[PDB]
């Protein structure tokens, strides 16, 4: 409806996209917490147990 600038929308869209990138940063950093097995095969013995 052109009740606000065309630059003031672009700045808000950029802030949206880079805070979405910060959420994806924190989501990848929290997905690294669950130690997903990077490969498929026979898994050996746990070199460290729970609590370490």
């Amino acid at each position: 409806d052109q009740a606000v600038s065309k630059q003031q929308y672009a700045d808000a869209n950029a802030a949206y996209l880079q805070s979405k990138a910060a959420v994806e940063q924190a989501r990848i950093n929290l997905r690294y917490t669950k130690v997903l097995s990077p490969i498929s095969g026979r898994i050996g013995r746990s070199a460290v147990t729970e609590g370490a």
Binding site: D1, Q2, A3, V4
Partner: protein, 53 residues
């Protein structure tokens, strides 16, 4: 002289009425924009009250 000045103020006040009708048009359009910017959520109700005043 009096008929000349009376016709002259008549025509000048025709022009004054036309310009204030244009200012009423621009204020009504600014109030339409501010009412949309309030119904969406960006501007508060205080900016809507400056638009109404």
């Amino acid at each position: 002289a009096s008929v000349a000045t009376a016709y002259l103020t008549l025509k000048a006040d025709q022009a004054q009425l036309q310009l204030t009708k244009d200012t009423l048009g621009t204020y009504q359009k600014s109030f339409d924009l501010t009412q949309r910017s309030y119904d969406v959520g960006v501007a508060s109700a205080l900016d809507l009250r400056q638009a109404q005043t």
